[PDB]
Every structure is written in C-alpha cells, then in structure tokens.
RNA sequence: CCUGCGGCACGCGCGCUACACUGACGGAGCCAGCGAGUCUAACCUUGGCCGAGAGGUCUUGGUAAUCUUGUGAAACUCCGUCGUGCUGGGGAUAGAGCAUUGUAAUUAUUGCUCUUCAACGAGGAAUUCCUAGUAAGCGC
C-alpha cells in the first residue's frame, strides 16, 4: 500500500490534520504550498519544524496539512504543531528510531509547544 | 441447575465457577449469622460488620452500605458475578455483548492502569472500576478513534 | 558522517563507552582523538612507528596500540598521552587483547 | 589539519526554500539579520536579568512569564521591549503591529550607527536603569524622601518602561512615528547624551537620591 | 515543467491578468463603471476607475476556476464588506449585484467561463487554458 | 503512623477524614509536614507532625496520586498523577501556588534530585523524563522501552516481546551525586542510566529462577510474578538496594578488583609509590597511589606516613583529590582498628580546608 | 565616581520595614570579605548582583 | 431535617463559595459582587470574562467548592442572582429588585466579616423550607453565642427581603443599626442540577401566566 | 448623544462617541465561536437576473452535523493616498430625493444617496471595574 502517518495539532480552537507519507518532498497546506501562509510575519513560525531539524529530512516525504477553526494566529500554531508531530511520528514508524530521538530532542530544546498541546486550562485561586 | 443458569447469563469459563462464588457468598452469611448472635450493644459487633460492609461495598457486591438486611438477602452469586471484568466491560458499553467482551479480554485488548489483564474472571473493585480502558495502540482502540475521525498517530493510536 | 584526518590507511577505530570521544590510528603514526557528540577534533597524537591494530577497553578508557617498532603502546583516552610502553617482542605483533 | 564532513549531498528541496533562509541555518539571527553572538552586556549586575544568551528568530515567544516571581527575567529582551510597546488602550492586544515596528526600528539603528541594533538595545537598558531610587517615608505625617538602592530586576523593568514611554510621548504630534523616535531614544540612550527621555529622567532619580541620604 | 494557477500567489496573478485583459482590450466594461460604489456598506467608488473592473474580473476568474460553480448571489457575499452604519454597529452587507452579474455575462463572451449544470457559473476549457498560460508567464517573471 | 527509633513507638497515627487507602508518602525534610496519596481519593492529604490533624487536602488531580516527594534544598513537594500532568506544589508561607507540567503517559514514577532543581519521572510509555522545577521545561528524556527484559509467564498466550506488562518502571531513585538513576519495575531487570550522557551503564537481571514466573524470555517447547518494587541508592553509595520478590538485593563495589586508573604517566608504577616512602616524599607517594586508584597501594601509603606530617600533607593535598581522599577514609575506618590514626586525618582534611568543603556542599555528599 | 557591585547573600525576614522596601545583607564582589546591610526597592532574591553608588553607608530601618 | 443534597456535609465541613460576575461587568455591579463576597464568609470573587459556564463549573467541582454565586445586572442596577450547589446539587435563580449598594452611602467604614447569626422569618411552605436549607448552608457552621452581626432573611409578601445588621445590647433593649445591602429578592426557578446543566429536572418554576397566579403564596 | 435616578430651568447614577499619523481614507490579504430557522403555513434563505446603494425580482436548499453556512464577522495584515491644518480628524444639527416594515411612519420606524461639517486639542473636584487567554480592543 502507501506508508502514511496521521498526526494532529491543536491550538485555541483550531485543528490540524497532517498526513505524512513517503514521497518526493512537497509540503502543502490546504491545497497550497507552505510558502503562501496568510499572516506573512508568522510564516517563520511554521518554518520552525522545517528549519530546526534541517530541511534534508523532508526530501522523501509529503506533508499534507489541512486546518479549520481558529484565527489567523491560532492556525499558525496548529500547523507548526502538526508538522512537528507528523515528522517525529514518521521516524518512529517507517524510518529509524535513532532519528526520532534526535528530532524529539531537537524540538524540545527549541520549543516544547511544537509537540504537546500547551493546554491553558483555567485555575481558580 | 441454578449454577448453570447463571453461568450462561454472565458467561463463565468453568461450570464450577458459580459454586466457587457460592462458597464465598455463603461464607458471608455464616459470618453474618454468628455476628447476629452477639448481643446488640457490643462495641465489637457494632464495629465489626461496619468494618465488613466497608469492604463488601468497596468491592461493590452490594448496592448500599446502610441496609443491614442486604447482607443476607442481596448477597447473591449473580451479585458477585457481575463485578466480573467482562460484565463491567459490558456495563461500561465497551464491548457490544458479554461474550464479545470475553473475546476481547482473552485476545488482550483491555487493561487496568499500567498492566493489561488477561484472566477474564478478574474481579474489579468499584474503586478500581474507574480505570479500565482499552490497551493503548491496540487495533480496537484505533478503530474507535477512526469513527470520530480523531486518531492521532503521534500517540500511535 | 565522514571523517577525514588520516592520509595513509586507517588501521583501527573505536568509540568510548560514553559515546563521547572517538580514537583512530593510522599507518602514518597519527593517533587522532575525536569528539563524537560535536564533530570537532579534540586532539591529535603522533607516535613513531606505523600502527597495525588497536584494542580499546571501554571500561577504563585505556587503549593499546601495536607499532612497527615491535612495542605495545598503551594510551589513556582521556588524558591524551602515552601511559605505558611495553618492550620485549622481537617480531610483528599479530593480535592482542585486554583482560 | 582536521576536517569533519557532516553533509554529504547538496541539500536541495522540492519546495524552494529561499537563498536567505538556507543560509540562516548556521546561526540563529533576530529577524534573519541580527546575530546574538558578539553581544555582551557591558554592565555587570545586569547579566542574569537581560537575557540575550538564547537566540531567537522573531520577538514572539508566547510562553508563560507571569507565573513565577522572577520568570519575567528570562524573556529575551527584544520581545520584552515589544511587549512594552503595546501600552495604551489604542494599542493593547496588537503585537504584530509592535513587532513590525521593532523590525522597522532595528533597521534604523543599523543605518545610522552600523554596530548592531541589538548591541544598542542592550546598551540602552544598561544606561537608563537607575542605581539609587528614592522612596517615601512615613515619618509621622511629614513625609520626606528617603533614598535607598534598587534591585536589578527593577533596574531593568523601569528602564524598558522609560524608553517606550519616552518614544510614545515624543512621537505624539509629529510626522516621526513610534518606530523612528524609539531609534532616536536607543541611540541617545546608548551614548547617554542627556538628550533622550530616559537618560534625562534617570538623572533626576539619581540626583534626588543623592540629595537626601 | 507545468503550472496551475494555484502555483502562483493570489495577488501577483490577478495583478498581471487584470493588466492582460486591459491590453487584450476585449472585455466589454459596461456603461457606467465610473459612478458605482461596488458594494453594500461602501463609501467611495473605486480609487482606480481605469483598471478596477479588470482587477475584479481577474479576481472572479481565479475564483470560479478554483471552484466547481459559484453564482451571482455568491460573488456579492464574497465582495460585500462590512458597512459602517455610523453611530450604529457594523454588520455585513453583500456587494452590488449588477456589477458581479456583469462580470459573469462579460466573461462568457471571451469564453473564460460558461453556464454550468446544477447552476452558477463554471470555468470553460478555453479559460482554463488562458489562466494556466499566464500562471506560467507570471511564474517566469524571473528574467 | 510515624515511628520512633530511639524508643520504638508510634508518635501519632495520622488518619484521613473518610478513611482512604494510602499508597505513597512524602516527608518534609524539616520534619513538620507528612503528605500522603491514595488510589481512592486522588487528594493529597497533608498532616502536621506535631498536631495529628490534617492541615489541608491539596487537590487538583484527575486520577490517583502515584508518588510524592519533597526536594530538601527548596522544600517543594511535586505530585504524581495518572492524568499525564506533573503538578509541582508550593505549600509553605502565603504562596499556595501549584505549577502543572503535562506528560505523555501515566506517570507512576517520581524522583527528586538532591540539588532540589530536577525531577525524574517514570511514565507508562517506558520513557524516563527529567524536568526542571524553577522552569516548567524539561532537560531531556531517556528511552527505556527497549532495554527492559520481560518474562513470559507460564499461563501466558503472547510472546514476551509484545506484552505490555513490564516495559515501564515502577520506581526511580537518583544517586546522591545527582548523576545516575536506578530504575526498577515489575520486569526482570534493573537499570543504571547516566543522567548527562543519557545512556544506560549496566543492566542487572534480578534473578534466574524457573520457579518464579517472570524470568524467561522464552519458555521451553498462578506462579508469583518476579518484579522489583522499590529501589534506592544508599548514602554510602557503594551499592543500591532493590527490593525484589526473592528478597531485598544489595549491589555494591566493596570488592574493588578493578583497574580504574587516573592520570597515569609512564613513570608511575606500583613500585615507584613504594620508593617514595623510602624517599620520604609523603605528598607524592599518596598522589602516586591515587593515580592507580588501587586500595592496597593506598593502604600502603596511608598507614605509612607519620603524625608530624599529616597536616603538612593535608595542606599539600589538592582540592580535586579532596572528595576522593575523604571517601577512602570513610570506607576504610569503619572496619579497621585505628581510631586515633584515622581521626587525625579527618581533623586534618576538615582543618586544612573547612571553607572549601562548606562552599561545595553539593560536591561532597557521600564523603560527609 | 567608581561604582562597587555587590552580590546578595540573604534577604532579611521579620524585620519591620516599610512596604515596598526589603532589607538585604549584600556581599562585596571585588572583595568577598565584607558585608553591608542595604535596602532594595524592587523584587530581589539571593545570588543576584546589586549596584551600590556608595559603599560606606549602611541602611537602617525606614519605619 | 436538612435537605438530601446538603445531608452529607451539613454541619461537618465549612462551605467555600465563589461570587462571580456575568460577562464584562459594569463597574457598579463589580462593586456589588464584592458586597456579596463580604456578606458571606468563605467567599472569593473571581472576575469572569471569556470563561464558559461549563469550564467554570467543571473547573470548580475539580477544585472543590460548595456552590457558586453568579450575578446579573441592568444598566448598573443588579437584577438577578443564582446560588448553585456543586456536587450535582440544586440551583436557585433569584430575581432581586430593590437594591442599595453599600458604596453609595458614606465612608462609614468596613464590615465585621465575623460569622453571622441568621434570621429566617415567615417560611411555612415545604418549598419555603427548600429555600431555607439552600440559603442557610452558605454560612460557616456554628456561630458564637455573642457574635455581633446578624443577617435577617425576611419573607413578607413572597419577596424574601434580606438585610444585614449589627447589634449591641443595652441595659434594657437591643439597639441595632444597618450596614451592607438592602435586597428584595424572589426566586423564580429551581433546578435540581447546577446552573451549567440547562436540562435538569425543574423542582419549582414561577408560573406567571395562570388564572390563579396572583392568588397563592409560594406559587 | 444614549440611558437610569432626582427635580421641575436643573441635581445624580449606568453608559456610547471621538478628539486622530499605534490614524483616516482606497484597494487588496482573509481567519472565529455560541447559535436560530417554514405549516397548516410564509421562517432561515444559496443561486440567476434588475438597482450606485437601500432594495426589487425569478427561482432553490433546509422541520436541519444534510440547506442558509466555511455565517469568507470585526478589529487585524499588506500596498497606496493624506501630512499636522478643528486637516482628509469628528459626524451633531439640518435641506432634498430614492427604498423597506406596516391598516397607519406627521412629532423624522428604519435603511440607502447628496449636501450641511457643530462641540470636542485627553477632560476640575470626584470616582468605577480588574491579576492570564484576564484587563482592554473587536465583531457575532
């Protein structure tokens, strides 16, 4: 068949459904390349999972990401979350394990919000 | 044939399972009886069955801990045979039927906290009844999350 | 990764127990000490003779070399200097091993 | 002497990542222009409170800095300068306007004084933060100004406050916007020229504290 | 090695194609085109009365392209903005219907769109060609 | 119930309100507060040591509290939850603020470093993570699902490779150096992870019994399970005791049949150190014997040099060897007849650098 | 006008000081011997370095 | 006899209650939530904005509080008020008509804040005893015999009228003076769930549109 | 100005608006959540067509996770015009015309279109609300 891995990414009320499959090296968001994300200042907020680990590791894979919900900013925190999760859950499945712990230690030292959803649940004092 | 008749309703491995409970469920009443033969204003006796109804309610064989009459009348094997694990997986609507829950336990899809459980006939405490889930990365917890279109393979669900 | 320090034949590699430091020995006499977490060359040691083989001992970070002047040279892997030199053979040392 | 070959093929991608971005993977640069290396806090007692060790791309770390008492220190000060730019009811909750100002402001400091913008901003906060601040005493109904010293966290907090307020007030009715007048502040606060807002207003706070001590 | 309009950024495309339909010269901009305000809660007529109707057709073509079919009531809502009611709250108002209906009848004469079944308007195989063509021309602007 | 060791008696038996089970426990280093945790309640009860009342019911977890620990340096207690979130409590002095850190899988293992600045966790995915406290972020995590040996039981129906019985760790304890973690669970194996280099050092099989169940990876072609319950590293630090099914194990290094040299030159041989005693260079022959790190050369030169040059030698001894020399005196003087000679050394080491040892309190823990 | 830095050792508790002002034994950085009991204004902890325009005054209570 | 929801706690555990405000409150009523925060003991005031009623309920059962006090207003005059017992307990939406905020009057000082005695007058109906046992448990148990402030809940004419008083006892008579708010108050619906639930069983509901609506009392 | 309370020209309370360049205006970029919706009838309404607009009209989907609706909301973002002038900031007061709801619009129901272009240059003494996705901005 086709080796794929599906991971999610979630900020305020925005989901991000990133299918990652072995391919040629195209990275789409909503049927559009990742060089055309809307807010235009926060475009480097989604180049973080591309440029932190190194752009070589996207040479064989596809990143189809589709997002709904949220606003202009809180979608950009969802596509940077589901690309980081979609990359680091393909190396534990279909590529080598020692790749994954190199990635999971790379995204961690930069920003842990790439991986686990920082849930700002309330607190009563 | 009461022993067979409740082995079917709850699905039991050995037909001897019933009388393996009904020896305990009789042993409750024999301790209930001799604790009824002590005089009523005895601080042993007043302490001692309330000590026991704490345990038989935590395990969940009896519905309430107030009525003292339940301890001889409502303590039945079919009461203790529905805190079985496959009945609880049918009560919590995990599996569709009660045979099918035995099919999922024996194949190894269900767990209590850390460790998965493999004997079908695991008694589950009412306190521990909170913690039964599908075992993680299973093919039966993966299918559930596909129905709501909410898988997340970073969990490798 | 592809490391390039030697120019003659490399005749023994090892990595330490901690996966931090890496040694290599050439027939040009260079015993190069690598870092492996970073890719930096930690240092570089040159003995006299060409070096046929290396046996590292990962428990204590000592490694021994077999030279062509018929002597076993044992070099500490941390302090980067010859600790023991063993004379007494009279022809080529085939193989050896630590205890 | 010695070489490490870590990259083996020419890394080319199917999605074209531009020439200025692929070059940016060696060092992390602020706004892809400004290096955090060779940036030294030239005043001791202010290191561990001006945080320029961890480099950043844009000044938008959305992490939690309000929870602990001194968690506010590890904010990388370029962001900590943008956060104090959105202080007005016409301006609260608009950060992308403020970040677009600083990226336009840090360009101006280069064009005028070649050095670095980010070396100037660090050198601005070292100068304007006061060294002795005066407090009110009770004194039984007759209050006199009693002079004390000041904690180095307050030295940073009030320094950042005086620069952005000094920029927001000087660009009140002028053709010069917030972006340029703040660069008129930080350059002057770097020299301490006594022609900026904060170097003046520090020089009362260290003047008054000398008068009664 | 092949291009679709989706390979060209939104604005630079409607920018070069709106200046392609002006040099082309056959559009049929209707009779008014200097006096209308274009929308519901609009204030002023377009700031460029020269090249706006061609800016808007060049938008309308890139939009029906990417879609199956879209009608007139749909172009209004896309092109309607918020209307300032003054001292009353702002709300959404659809744009002017005659304008967007007269971009649709007028893009059927150059053949960039056609009547669809199911309703609406749909891009025509010829207009699918022209749009892909200038999606390359714009793509190649790099000398 | 608290117990005395001078008198062998309860002080007070602390109880809850509605009679809850208590799994685990955490004691204030300044022995004022005893905290405990349940499976029934998931509320952290807090008792004072003097008044047997419960001071407060610290709550906010979904799912039960697995473990509870207090860092001695900062006096902060960090809760363990099955909700996959680690919450650090701060309970002293008008603050009452709880900081929560999210975790990927149910955390059943909590370890507090001596420093008081790091927290070591053992989740259910196998992986052991190491968090900071003053920040919510993590330093790193170390991966423990592969290097765990798991038994196939007799009554099993699955391979030992893909059962999820034992691939996590139901205990963790930092060494008092703060550089190593020993972990142990319901598996057959104990581990020794290095904390900075993030790699395990050596893996210990607890037992090889066919009588116990969880031993064999592969059976030939109910019985009690073999698992380690709780593991701690001793203050003396020679060995870490792991509490097994077979009984409490003790591992150690009191053999020292091992050549672990330090800074050898070619000039340094065992005979050379003996020559120094003839030469009367006590300072050298001790350092020349510390370079081999062998105990019989050290006892040759430790017992040789006289009283009149003990403090001259103590001043001469370098700061780097001060932690090492103190540890050697600690293990030797317990079973050795020389009280008077050993105490003059510990007078001299303390007398020579009282301030240095006090300044590096973290550096010397096992030696003290 | 030379300025002498100082490192904070120990914040002082239970001293009756005017609110906002806290009281701190500092240690001189350039010579680790001395100490001077000065007052701070902002929020201060241990192990942070403080700036003194004058060394020899030693601040008392502020009522 | 106490109510079945309040039966397990009744005298044993003190209540802890939360006074919170509707959504973007006017500065008059944001004062007025503080008089409710002062009229009870064990009351904290958490300003509400961009909370939902689920995640303010659900993050309160978690932290463990007895009940929840939410207010509403019209143009600064507060109008409505609900008390909702949390562990699946009842709720009581009150309409309150005649209010006099404490910050209007004078800078006479500040309240006593000590445990109050209570006064419940003219509660005869069984539904009237529900309103007794749902209001009474908002105060900390067992007040002292000589505490000095007493909070009256008076029910003349179906409008529960609550005033706050201090008292001292002279050589012959008690002499009192008023501090704190004047209310009229009227409950109009009583769910068995919390105020989250919105489909719980309705124990009582003020019927307005009935031929005998004005006739009966507690109807 | 809106509103409540007093008073009977005014006193008081809750509020809305803007004084502008962190703006306005013109293009352009284009992202929410909670929600409601038609039977014995006229509901939410795409789409087409007509109208500068407001609206009109011919049709359609939906008793609804199904059709309206991805409610393409607004602040916000970019490019441009204006250039510190009660200015292009502000839109009160008012003239004239065109629409909508309604048996009925005069004392203007409301909407649209052109003209009219006021006070207000940050607000005395007073005083309100508020500790994290909150305050404030912003639309539904």
mmCIF file of N, CA, C and O in Angstrom, chain D residues 116-171:
data_model
loop_
_atom_site.group_PDB
_atom_site.id
_atom_site.type_symbol
_atom_site.label_atom_id
_atom_site.label_comp_id
_atom_site.label_asym_id
_atom_site.label_seq_id
_atom_site.Cartn_x
_atom_site.Cartn_y
_atom_site.Cartn_z
ATOM 1 N N UNK D 116 25.338 47.277 15.704
ATOM 2 C CA UNK D 116 24.270 46.297 15.783
ATOM 3 C C UNK D 116 23.112 47.079 16.338
ATOM 4 O O UNK D 116 23.335 47.982 17.149
ATOM 5 N N UNK D 117 21.888 46.794 15.941
ATOM 6 C CA UNK D 117 20.769 47.242 16.753
ATOM 7 C C UNK D 117 20.737 46.559 18.094
ATOM 8 O O UNK D 117 20.490 47.226 19.100
ATOM 9 N N UNK D 118 21.040 45.266 18.161
ATOM 10 C CA UNK D 118 20.763 44.550 19.394
ATOM 11 C C UNK D 118 21.857 44.787 20.425
ATOM 12 O O UNK D 118 21.627 44.622 21.627
ATOM 13 N N UNK D 119 23.038 45.234 20.001
ATOM 14 C CA UNK D 119 24.028 45.672 20.971
ATOM 15 C C UNK D 119 23.644 47.015 21.559
ATOM 16 O O UNK D 119 23.938 47.296 22.724
ATOM 17 N N UNK D 120 22.929 47.827 20.788
ATOM 18 C CA UNK D 120 22.488 49.134 21.255
ATOM 19 C C UNK D 120 21.354 48.989 22.261
ATOM 20 O O UNK D 120 21.336 49.667 23.300
ATOM 21 N N UNK D 121 20.411 48.086 21.987
ATOM 22 C CA UNK D 121 19.253 47.901 22.864
ATOM 23 C C UNK D 121 19.698 47.373 24.221
ATOM 24 O O UNK D 121 19.201 47.805 25.271
ATOM 25 N N UNK D 122 20.662 46.457 24.223
ATOM 26 C CA UNK D 122 21.252 46.003 25.473
ATOM 27 C C UNK D 122 22.005 47.139 26.149
ATOM 28 O O UNK D 122 21.870 47.358 27.355
ATOM 29 N N UNK D 123 22.754 47.927 25.376
ATOM 30 C CA UNK D 123 23.462 49.056 25.968
ATOM 31 C C UNK D 123 22.523 50.182 26.367
ATOM 32 O O UNK D 123 22.898 51.035 27.173
ATOM 33 N N UNK D 124 21.308 50.213 25.818
ATOM 34 C CA UNK D 124 20.347 51.219 26.253
ATOM 35 C C UNK D 124 19.828 50.912 27.646
ATOM 36 O O UNK D 124 19.753 51.795 28.500
ATOM 37 N N UNK D 125 19.469 49.651 27.890
ATOM 38 C CA UNK D 125 18.872 49.268 29.162
ATOM 39 C C UNK D 125 19.894 49.345 30.288
ATOM 40 O O UNK D 125 19.544 49.659 31.431
ATOM 41 N N UNK D 126 21.173 49.126 29.980
ATOM 42 C CA UNK D 126 22.212 49.258 30.997
ATOM 43 C C UNK D 126 22.372 50.704 31.447
ATOM 44 O O UNK D 126 22.732 50.965 32.601
ATOM 45 N N UNK D 127 22.107 51.659 30.563
ATOM 46 C CA UNK D 127 22.338 53.047 30.934
ATOM 47 C C UNK D 127 21.152 53.640 31.680
ATOM 48 O O UNK D 127 21.342 54.353 32.670
ATOM 49 N N UNK D 128 19.922 53.358 31.246
ATOM 50 C CA UNK D 128 18.803 54.156 31.743
ATOM 51 C C UNK D 128 18.275 53.664 33.083
ATOM 52 O O UNK D 128 17.625 54.428 33.797
ATOM 53 N N UNK D 129 18.503 52.402 33.428
ATOM 54 C CA UNK D 129 18.058 51.879 34.697
ATOM 55 C C UNK D 129 18.796 52.514 35.855
ATOM 56 O O UNK D 129 20.027 52.493 35.907
ATOM 57 N N UNK D 130 18.057 53.096 36.795
ATOM 58 C CA UNK D 130 18.691 53.862 37.869
ATOM 59 C C UNK D 130 19.457 52.987 38.842
ATOM 60 O O UNK D 130 19.317 51.765 38.859
ATOM 61 N N UNK D 131 20.284 53.634 39.646
ATOM 62 C CA UNK D 131 21.159 52.917 40.552
ATOM 63 C C UNK D 131 20.771 53.133 41.998
ATOM 64 O O UNK D 131 21.002 52.262 42.838
ATOM 65 N N UNK D 132 20.202 54.288 42.309
ATOM 66 C CA UNK D 132 19.583 54.532 43.598
ATOM 67 C C UNK D 132 18.290 55.281 43.382
ATOM 68 O O UNK D 132 18.279 56.358 42.789
ATOM 69 N N UNK D 133 17.211 54.713 43.883
ATOM 70 C CA UNK D 133 15.905 55.316 43.746
ATOM 71 C C UNK D 133 15.404 55.700 45.122
ATOM 72 O O UNK D 133 15.717 55.061 46.122
ATOM 73 N N UNK D 134 14.614 56.756 45.160
ATOM 74 C CA UNK D 134 14.197 57.368 46.406
ATOM 75 C C UNK D 134 12.782 56.922 46.715
ATOM 76 O O UNK D 134 11.954 56.816 45.808
ATOM 77 N N UNK D 135 12.499 56.664 47.983
ATOM 78 C CA UNK D 135 11.160 56.262 48.376
ATOM 79 C C UNK D 135 10.584 57.224 49.401
ATOM 80 O O UNK D 135 11.296 58.009 50.031
ATOM 81 N N UNK D 136 9.267 57.151 49.550
ATOM 82 C CA UNK D 136 8.572 57.958 50.529
ATOM 83 C C UNK D 136 8.639 57.273 51.889
ATOM 84 O O UNK D 136 8.568 56.049 51.986
ATOM 85 N N UNK D 137 8.805 58.072 52.933
ATOM 86 C CA UNK D 137 8.830 57.557 54.293
ATOM 87 C C UNK D 137 7.515 57.960 54.946
ATOM 88 O O UNK D 137 6.807 58.840 54.450
ATOM 89 N N UNK D 138 7.164 57.284 56.037
ATOM 90 C CA UNK D 138 6.015 57.702 56.807
ATOM 91 C C UNK D 138 6.322 58.954 57.595
ATOM 92 O O UNK D 138 5.787 60.030 57.306
ATOM 93 N N UNK D 139 7.195 58.824 58.593
ATOM 94 C CA UNK D 139 7.719 59.968 59.323
ATOM 95 C C UNK D 139 6.725 60.704 60.194
ATOM 96 O O UNK D 139 7.031 61.803 60.670
ATOM 97 N N UNK D 140 5.548 60.131 60.431
ATOM 98 C CA UNK D 140 4.557 60.768 61.273
ATOM 99 C C UNK D 140 3.888 61.982 60.661
ATOM 100 O O UNK D 140 3.899 63.067 61.256
ATOM 101 N N UNK D 141 3.309 61.823 59.469
ATOM 102 C CA UNK D 141 2.560 62.886 58.828
ATOM 103 C C UNK D 141 3.376 63.873 58.017
ATOM 104 O O UNK D 141 2.804 64.575 57.173
ATOM 105 N N UNK D 142 4.684 63.959 58.245
ATOM 106 C CA UNK D 142 5.562 64.828 57.471
ATOM 107 C C UNK D 142 6.497 63.948 56.664
ATOM 108 O O UNK D 142 7.498 63.450 57.190
ATOM 109 N N UNK D 143 6.179 63.763 55.387
ATOM 110 C CA UNK D 143 6.875 62.811 54.534
ATOM 111 C C UNK D 143 8.101 63.477 53.920
ATOM 112 O O UNK D 143 7.991 64.534 53.295
ATOM 113 N N UNK D 144 9.258 62.853 54.104
ATOM 114 C CA UNK D 144 10.471 63.248 53.414
ATOM 115 C C UNK D 144 10.889 62.123 52.486
ATOM 116 O O UNK D 144 10.524 60.964 52.690
ATOM 117 N N UNK D 145 11.631 62.475 51.448
ATOM 118 C CA UNK D 145 12.122 61.483 50.510
ATOM 119 C C UNK D 145 13.350 60.790 51.077
ATOM 120 O O UNK D 145 14.394 61.416 51.264
ATOM 121 N N UNK D 146 13.224 59.499 51.355
ATOM 122 C CA UNK D 146 14.323 58.700 51.887
ATOM 123 C C UNK D 146 14.933 57.889 50.759
ATOM 124 O O UNK D 146 14.217 57.195 50.036
ATOM 125 N N UNK D 147 16.252 57.980 50.605
ATOM 126 C CA UNK D 147 16.918 57.369 49.463
ATOM 127 C C UNK D 147 17.416 55.975 49.793
ATOM 128 O O UNK D 147 18.086 55.763 50.804
ATOM 129 N N UNK D 148 17.089 55.021 48.928
ATOM 130 C CA UNK D 148 17.525 53.644 49.064
ATOM 131 C C UNK D 148 18.133 53.189 47.747
ATOM 132 O O UNK D 148 18.287 53.966 46.807
ATOM 133 N N UNK D 149 18.491 51.916 47.695
ATOM 134 C CA UNK D 149 19.014 51.289 46.493
ATOM 135 C C UNK D 149 17.890 50.562 45.770
ATOM 136 O O UNK D 149 16.750 50.527 46.230
ATOM 137 N N UNK D 150 18.227 49.961 44.643
ATOM 138 C CA UNK D 150 17.215 49.379 43.783
ATOM 139 C C UNK D 150 17.681 48.023 43.266
ATOM 140 O O UNK D 150 18.847 47.828 42.906
ATOM 141 N N UNK D 151 16.763 47.060 43.305
ATOM 142 C CA UNK D 151 17.032 45.710 42.850
ATOM 143 C C UNK D 151 17.238 45.681 41.344
ATOM 144 O O UNK D 151 16.582 46.420 40.613
ATOM 145 N N UNK D 152 18.139 44.824 40.848
ATOM 146 C CA UNK D 152 18.445 44.846 39.415
ATOM 147 C C UNK D 152 17.333 44.346 38.526
ATOM 148 O O UNK D 152 17.414 44.536 37.311
ATOM 149 N N UNK D 153 16.296 43.711 39.066
ATOM 150 C CA UNK D 153 15.139 43.436 38.231
ATOM 151 C C UNK D 153 14.332 44.699 37.997
ATOM 152 O O UNK D 153 13.873 44.957 36.880
ATOM 153 N N UNK D 154 14.153 45.505 39.042
ATOM 154 C CA UNK D 154 13.506 46.802 38.903
ATOM 155 C C UNK D 154 14.321 47.734 38.025
ATOM 156 O O UNK D 154 13.753 48.566 37.308
ATOM 157 N N UNK D 155 15.650 47.589 38.043
ATOM 158 C CA UNK D 155 16.502 48.379 37.169
ATOM 159 C C UNK D 155 16.236 48.075 35.707
ATOM 160 O O UNK D 155 16.398 48.948 34.856
ATOM 161 N N UNK D 156 15.835 46.851 35.386
ATOM 162 C CA UNK D 156 15.519 46.535 34.002
ATOM 163 C C UNK D 156 14.085 46.931 33.681
ATOM 164 O O UNK D 156 13.812 47.487 32.611
ATOM 165 N N UNK D 157 13.159 46.653 34.609
ATOM 166 C CA UNK D 157 11.734 46.892 34.381
ATOM 167 C C UNK D 157 11.442 48.360 34.137
ATOM 168 O O UNK D 157 10.694 48.710 33.226
ATOM 169 N N UNK D 158 12.024 49.228 34.953
ATOM 170 C CA UNK D 158 11.767 50.645 34.784
ATOM 171 C C UNK D 158 12.563 51.207 33.618
ATOM 172 O O UNK D 158 12.161 52.210 33.027
ATOM 173 N N UNK D 159 13.670 50.560 33.248
ATOM 174 C CA UNK D 159 14.441 51.007 32.096
ATOM 175 C C UNK D 159 13.655 50.814 30.811
ATOM 176 O O UNK D 159 13.576 51.715 29.977
ATOM 177 N N UNK D 160 13.084 49.625 30.639
ATOM 178 C CA UNK D 160 12.272 49.319 29.467
ATOM 179 C C UNK D 160 11.028 50.194 29.437
ATOM 180 O O UNK D 160 10.583 50.635 28.370
ATOM 181 N N UNK D 161 10.491 50.514 30.614
ATOM 182 C CA UNK D 161 9.311 51.363 30.693
ATOM 183 C C UNK D 161 9.611 52.780 30.229
ATOM 184 O O UNK D 161 8.806 53.391 29.523
ATOM 185 N N UNK D 162 10.776 53.314 30.595
ATOM 186 C CA UNK D 162 11.055 54.712 30.292
ATOM 187 C C UNK D 162 11.393 54.913 28.825
ATOM 188 O O UNK D 162 11.171 55.995 28.278
ATOM 189 N N UNK D 163 11.943 53.891 28.177
ATOM 190 C CA UNK D 163 12.294 54.029 26.770
ATOM 191 C C UNK D 163 11.049 54.086 25.900
ATOM 192 O O UNK D 163 10.891 55.003 25.084
ATOM 193 N N UNK D 164 10.144 53.130 26.079
ATOM 194 C CA UNK D 164 8.965 53.054 25.234
ATOM 195 C C UNK D 164 7.980 54.177 25.529
ATOM 196 O O UNK D 164 7.317 54.666 24.613
ATOM 197 N N UNK D 165 7.860 54.591 26.792
ATOM 198 C CA UNK D 165 7.048 55.764 27.103
ATOM 199 C C UNK D 165 7.693 57.016 26.533
ATOM 200 O O UNK D 165 7.009 57.878 25.969
ATOM 201 N N UNK D 166 9.015 57.107 26.616
ATOM 202 C CA UNK D 166 9.752 58.202 26.022
ATOM 203 C C UNK D 166 9.648 58.266 24.519
ATOM 204 O O UNK D 166 9.739 59.341 23.926
ATOM 205 N N UNK D 167 9.475 57.111 23.888
ATOM 206 C CA UNK D 167 9.230 57.100 22.453
ATOM 207 C C UNK D 167 7.776 57.407 22.141
ATOM 208 O O UNK D 167 7.477 58.097 21.161
ATOM 209 N N UNK D 168 6.860 56.896 22.961
ATOM 210 C CA UNK D 168 5.440 57.098 22.704
ATOM 211 C C UNK D 168 5.032 58.538 22.954
ATOM 212 O O UNK D 168 4.120 59.051 22.303
ATOM 213 N N UNK D 169 5.714 59.226 23.865
ATOM 214 C CA UNK D 169 5.387 60.612 24.146
ATOM 215 C C UNK D 169 6.051 61.576 23.177
ATOM 216 O O UNK D 169 5.440 62.584 22.811
ATOM 217 N N UNK D 170 7.271 61.284 22.738
ATOM 218 C CA UNK D 170 7.949 62.187 21.813
ATOM 219 C C UNK D 170 7.321 62.124 20.428
ATOM 220 O O UNK D 170 7.327 63.112 19.689
ATOM 221 N N UNK D 171 6.787 60.973 20.054
ATOM 222 C CA UNK D 171 6.049 60.854 18.798
ATOM 223 C C UNK D 171 4.549 61.010 19.035
ATOM 224 O O UNK D 171 3.744 60.182 18.620
#
